[PDB]
Amino acid sequence: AMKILTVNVHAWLEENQMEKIDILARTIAEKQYDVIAMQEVNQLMNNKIIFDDIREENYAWVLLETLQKYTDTDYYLHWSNSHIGFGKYNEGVAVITRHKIKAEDEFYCTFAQSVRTISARRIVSITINYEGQDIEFYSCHMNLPNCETEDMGKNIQTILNRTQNSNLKILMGDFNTDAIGNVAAYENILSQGLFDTYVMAEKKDDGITVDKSDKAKKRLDYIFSNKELKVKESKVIFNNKNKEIVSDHFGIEVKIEF
Ligand SMILES: [Mg+2]
């Protein structure tokens, strides 16, 4: 039994930011997620390094320090910068985890690899040894499918080919692709040898992750798998129904057993 969460946090670009961080932290605390995957995690280019490449007030780092307020459980942070973002931010992705790790990677899944290009996207992977199996978790934030300088297929192939093994690869995040609207581009995702935990789930809700208040209701965020899994549940979270809103995207919360 393992519980996963993925959430595009729109870091430091949200109104009411501190309360929203607090909501997120409190939730992670109650639920005790094994792995949290986060996209649009920002830090100010001009702030001091704390350590590695992480600058003061990095959203993820703040989240973690807030998390410590509500749980004794040791959480670990792995973050990677992608490109120069909104304003004077570094935009990146992160993974938080309850578990210690065997491996960590940060790499570009895109052809663009310059911090000066919006379409350069770095991925963060984590390897956990769990119940005598090695599992790789990937936090992803992809470009629009129609993006004329990146091939989403190729990019996904880069992620999947980063390690050459027969490990369970779990691949989490914002894919900028509506499973309802642009079906051909969502089908294309799966063509890469991917299984969608939403579809595989025993219990599920409507699955909507972005709401612009059916005209404007979308499913843009996912949790994919390279193998078929026993997926007990797949709920949306932080949507003012199951927990308060913390971003401009809602999060996905998935329960897997193995
Ligand atoms: Mg956004």
Side-chain angles (χ1 to χ4, degrees), residues 1-255:
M2 169 178 259
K3 303 156 90 176
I4 279 189
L5 161 74
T6 184
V7 54
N8 178 315
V9 283
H10 203 218
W12 306 122
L13 304 174
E14 283 294 298
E15 275 176 347
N16 227 277
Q17 191 65 99
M18 297 313 138
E19 208 201 317
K20 281 167 173 166
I21 287 165
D22 206 65
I23 311 271
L24 182 48
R26 283 181 174 282
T27 309
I28 296 177
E30 298 173 354
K31 293 224 149 154
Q32 287 295 307
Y33 296 111
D34 295 77
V35 171
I36 297 99
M38 286 178 293
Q39 308 78 40
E40 297 200 65
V41 171
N42 303 309
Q43 70 185 9
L44 280 157
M45 304 182 309
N46 278 334
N47 279 14
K48 303 271 185 187
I49 262 95
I50 306 160
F51 73 110
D52 288 327
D53 194 21
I54 294 183
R55 292 181 190 275
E56 282 180 69
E57 291 183 334
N58 176 299
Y59 181 102
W61 180 252
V62 175
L63 179 43
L64 209 80
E65 268 182 359
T66 306
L67 185 45
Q68 284 165 22
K69 234 167 192 149
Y70 305 112
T71 313
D72 284 353
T73 299
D74 292 331
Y75 274 84
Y76 313 111
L77 163 64
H78 316 270
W79 176 85
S80 192
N81 155 78
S82 289
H83 55 249
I84 288 155
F86 289 95
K88 286 189 161 108
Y89 294 120
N90 297 146
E91 196 169 300
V93 287
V95 177
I96 306 288
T97 182
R98 248 171 65 198
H99 302 287
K100 294 178 170 165
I101 60 153
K102 307 272 264 222
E104 195 266 13
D105 209 343
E106 301 161 24
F107 62 100
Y108 282 104
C109 76
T110 53
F111 179 84
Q113 298 172 18
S114 161
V115 298
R116 284 145 30 92
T117 304
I118 292 301
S119 60
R121 306 291 168 101
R122 193 113 69 165
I123 306 288
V124 174
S125 78
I126 230 63
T127 309
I128 320 264
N129 183 241
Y130 193 35
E131 307 205 51
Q133 189 190 355
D134 285 1
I135 309 159
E136 293 166 14
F137 289 95
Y138 293 76
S139 188
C140 325
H141 180 217
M142 317 296 293
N143 300 295
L144 297 166
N146 62 9
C147 163
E148 51 172 301
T149 75
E150 307 291 335
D151 178 65
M152 164 101 64
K154 274 210 193 74
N155 294 352
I156 288 173
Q157 282 307 131
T158 304
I159 295 165
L160 291 167
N161 291 313
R162 183 75 189 172
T163 65
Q164 297 287 115
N165 56 13
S166 43
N167 269 8
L168 172 61
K169 285 167 190 202
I170 289 163
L171 200 144
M172 298 165 285
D174 185 15
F175 282 76
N176 279 313
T177 300
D178 199 10
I180 326 171
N182 202 334
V183 210
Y186 159 76
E187 220 85 298
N188 194 249
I189 310 267
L190 306 165
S191 308
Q192 309 301 324
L194 284 182
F195 300 84
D196 180 355
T197 63
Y198 177 72
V199 184
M200 282 186 298
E202 278 177 350
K203 278 147 187 191
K204 42 172 151 286
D205 54 10
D206 59 19
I208 300 310
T209 55
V210 183
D211 187 331
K212 299 189 199 280
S213 309
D214 283 293
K215 161 81 195 173
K217 286 222 272 264
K218 296 184 166 98
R219 191 171 127 238
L220 290 193
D221 299 78
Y222 304 89
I223 287 157
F224 296 116
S225 193
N226 65 332
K227 301 195 215 275
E228 220 159 344
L229 288 189
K230 173 50 196 280
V231 187
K232 186 133 172 157
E233 184 162 12
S234 171
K235 294 321 168 81
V236 178
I237 185 164
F238 308 126
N239 63 349
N240 290 329
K241 271 162 276 160
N242 174 41
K243 253 80 187 162
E244 293 160 283
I245 279 178
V246 303
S247 182
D248 64 355
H249 284 235
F250 316 139
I252 294 166
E253 173 203 4
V254 164
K255 194 191 152 203

